[PDB]
């Protein structure tokens, strides 16, 4: 009350919650990127110099 | 002795919010690391 305003308690609790969610989202983004079809070149028609038709 | 927030009507909503966040994050991590491929 001397320094911090009224909503500082809710702001600090929401900051802890958002930091935990941000850590989880970063781990999730790293895992999805290392398992993604773009990274692993999956389900993409890789272009050939002749475009041979199987 | 009783806790600090004993008798507060927001305690069980915030406990359900924390447990819901934990189970959603756990299920999402399980999906990404086991059922994603």
């Amino acid at each position: 009350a001397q320094i911090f305003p009224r909503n500082a308690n809710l702001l600090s609790r929401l900051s802890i919650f958002a930091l935990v969610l941000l850590v989880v989202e970063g781990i999730l983004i790293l895992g999805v990127y290392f398992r993604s079809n773009y990274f692993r070149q999956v389900n993409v028609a890789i272009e050939q110099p002749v475009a041979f038709s199987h | 002795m009783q806790p600090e927030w004993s008798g507060d009507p927001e305690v069980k909503p915030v406990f359900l919010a924390v447990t819901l966040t934990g189970m959603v994050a756990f299920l999402l991590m399980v999906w990404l690391f086991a059922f994603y491929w």
């Binding site: 969610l21 989880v24 989202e25 983004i29 993604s36 079809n37 | 919010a17 819901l20």
Partner: peptide
């Protein structure tokens, strides 16, 4: 406030499903 926790969890869930779908894009 638990309602802001619920809204932040919903935002995190929506963004995570967008991330998963972009991984399977």
């Amino acid at each position: 406030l638990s309602r802001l926790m619920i809204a932040g969890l919903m935002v995190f869930l929506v963004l995570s499903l967008v991330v998963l779908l972009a991984g399977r894009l």
